Each structure stands twice: as C-alpha cells, then as structure tokens.
A paper describes a structure:
Siderophore-binding proteins from two thermophilic bacteria, Geobacillus stearothermophilus and Parageobacillus thermoglucosidasius, were identified from a search of sequence databases, cloned and overexpressed. They are homologues of the well characterized protein CjCeuE from Campylobacter jejuni. The proteins have a two-domain structure, with the domains linked by a long α-helix at the base of the fold. The siderophore binding sites sit between the two domains.
The structures of the complexes of Gst with azotochelin and 5-LICAM were solved using the apo protein as a search model. In the complex with azotochelin there was a single protein complex in the asymmetric unit, with density from Glu25 to Lys300, while the crystals of the complex with 5-LICAM contained two independent complexes both with density for residues Glu24–Lys300. The ligand structures superimpose closely on the apo model, with r.m.s.d.s over 273 equivalent Cα atoms of 0.61 Å for the azotochelin complex and 0.48 Å for the 5-LICAM complex. As expected, the Fe atom of the ligand in both Gst complexes is bound by the four catecholate O atoms and the conserved His218 and Tyr279. Several of the loop regions on the surface of the protein have high B values and show high flexibility in all three structures, with some variation between the three. However, the regions around the siderophore site are well ordered. The solvent tolerance of Gst is slightly lower than that of Pth, with an approximately fivefold increase in K d observed at 20% DMF.
Residue numbers in the entry: 24 to 300
Write the structure that this text describes.
C-alpha cells in the first residue's frame, strides 16, 4: 500500500494508486494517457501536439517545464510528482511539496531503463498486464526496424538558432544507434549533453552519412520550423543523405518535448522505420 521507489535522485515513498498525480515528463504523461490513468496537473505552457487534450482546463496548470508553479503545487498537495532531466535541479523543492520520482531514461541503458520506468508505472497504478502487452508490441517494432537498419550509416543532428548540434551512441537520441540498430556515421561521438555537441556544417559534410536524422528544436521551443531552412547549406548538399533524399525530419513534439513513454517510444520507432524505408 506504500511503495518505496529507488530512483536516480533518491528514494520516494508513494502510496499505491496515488490520487493526485502531477506530471512534468511528457513521456510519462503519454504513458498514463495510454493506460487510462487520471492526471491532476502538468505544466501547460508547452504541451506536445499529440498530447494537446492535456491543455484542457480540466487539468491544473503547474507552470512550465523549467519553472514549476510551486504555489499551485502547494495548493494541490500531490500524492506523486513525476520529473525528468529538465527538473532535476529542482528535486529538493518539489520533494518538499510532495513525493517526487525522477523518471528520466538512463540513455547508457535505454531499453532496460525504459522497461523499468514503464514497469514501475504499471505497479503504481495496477496496470502491469497492459504495460507488458505494450512493451511486447514495442519489442516487435524494434526487431522489425533492426532488419531495415543494416548498413545505413546515420548522423543525428538537432537544429536550433540556425545552428547544428550532433548526437551519437549513449546520448539523448542514442537509441537510434543503440536500440534500433542504425550504424553511426561518427562512432567516436561521445555526447552526454541535453542539447548535443556543437559542430560545423563542414563536420556534417566530412562525415558524409547515408542518412541524416534531424530534430527541429526551434519548432517546439520557439514555435517556428527552422530545420529545413537550416539544412539549406552548401556543404550539407554534398552528402549522400542530401543527394538520395534521405534527410529524415523527426517530429520534435515526440523526440524533443517528450520521449520515453509507451506512445512516444512507439511513434519514435515508426518515424525511424518510415524514414529508412
Ligand atoms: O536542463 C535542461 N535545460 C537547461 C537549459 C535550458 C536552456 C533554455 N531552454 C529552453 O528555453 C527550453 C524550453 C522548452 C524546452 C526545452 O527543452 C528547452 O531547452 C534540459 C534537460 C534535459 C532536456 C532538455 O531539453 C533540457 O533543456
Ligand atoms: Fe531543452
């Protein structure tokens, strides 16, 4: 009836089937959506398109992803607060208000970490069988995309402010290489930074990948698509990716604002599969 949860930032004591659930990670939000679990509150300042129903006033607004409304959280008295990387620095302040579970993915072990996070949610809400069904469905997706991914060397690029940053194995977006079997154009790219590693257009040209996965950060942070325009560049057009029409624009509503949930991971895999073949 009381759960002891060991997470990356500490230990939370949470009542099973907690009544008031507050969510600061959109992957967890889409997980609770999928499982039919009622949510009390979330930061409504920037909600992913696919989760737009959670913009409803039926949900209490607890601010933005990096600025929680502590007054409002105090008023709610949550039974559980779910957080991920963007709120890690505020863990103590949140835990003072209610039980706080860090449920970001450890990208050094994406599949294991994802699995554990989802199974925890199943245990907390009595949804263990439905979580297991969805995890099996996702495994089937992964296997299928692995067959498509052979020999297709890829570089992962995020665009922001007319600039490009790169990601590789073990990184925020490492699962493309680490789970879905897409080979790395740059196997030595060792990225642990949320916003990736600054690189030149010349660097992209030099790596000359078969496939270029592009995540438009400005589309969700600034509200205007800038990825196509940013990729419009003399040196990038020299790559096999540009030539062969293998520049794949991954939806930042899923990849950037969200990720690590039942629905977001499923849709992420679909976007990779569709991009390859
Ligand atoms: O710690 C983080 N950011 C601190 C620096 C913020 C720099 C300012 N960013 C924005 O205004 C912004 C707004 C909405 C969503 C975002 O992710 C943003 O980065 C962070 C952690 C994990 C994932 C991210 O993505 C992050 O950012
Ligand atoms: Fe960010």
């Amino acid at each position: 009836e009381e759960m002891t949860i060991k997470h990356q930032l500490g230990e939370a004591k949470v009542k099973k089937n907690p009544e008031k659930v507050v969510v600061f990670d959109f992957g967890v939000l889409d997980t609770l959506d999928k499982l039919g679990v009622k949510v009390t509150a979330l930061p409504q300042m920037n909600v992913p398109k696919y989760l737009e129903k959670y913009k409803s006033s039926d949900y209490q607004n607890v601010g933005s992803l990096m600025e929680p409304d502590f007054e409002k959280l105090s008023e709610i008295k949550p039974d559980v607060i779910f957080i991920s990387g963007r709120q890690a620095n505020l863990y103590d302040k949140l835990k003072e208000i209610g039980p706080t579970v860090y449920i970001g993915i450890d990208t050094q072990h994406y599949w294991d970490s994802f699995t554990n996070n989802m199974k925890l949610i199943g245990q907390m809400f009595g949804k263990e069988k439905e979580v297991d069904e969805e995890l099996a469905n996702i495994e089937k997706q992964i296997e299928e995309v692995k067959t498509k991914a052979a020999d297709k060397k890829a570089l992962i690029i995020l665009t922001t402010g007319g600039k490009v940053s790169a990601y590789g194995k073990g990184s925020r977006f490492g699962l493309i290489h680490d789970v879905l079997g897409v080979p790395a154009a740059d196997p030595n790219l060792k990225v642990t930074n949320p916003h990736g590693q600054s690189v030149s257009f010349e660097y992209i040209a030099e790596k000359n990948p078969d496939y270029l996965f592009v995540i438009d950060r400005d589309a969700v942070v600034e509200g205007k698509p800038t990825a196509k325009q940013t990729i419009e560049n003399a040196l990038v057009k020299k790559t096999k990716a540009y030539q062969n029409g293998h520049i794949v624009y991954l939806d930042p509503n899923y990849w950037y604002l969200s990720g690590g949930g039942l629905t977001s991971v499923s849709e992420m895999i679909k976007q990779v599969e569709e991009g390859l073949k």
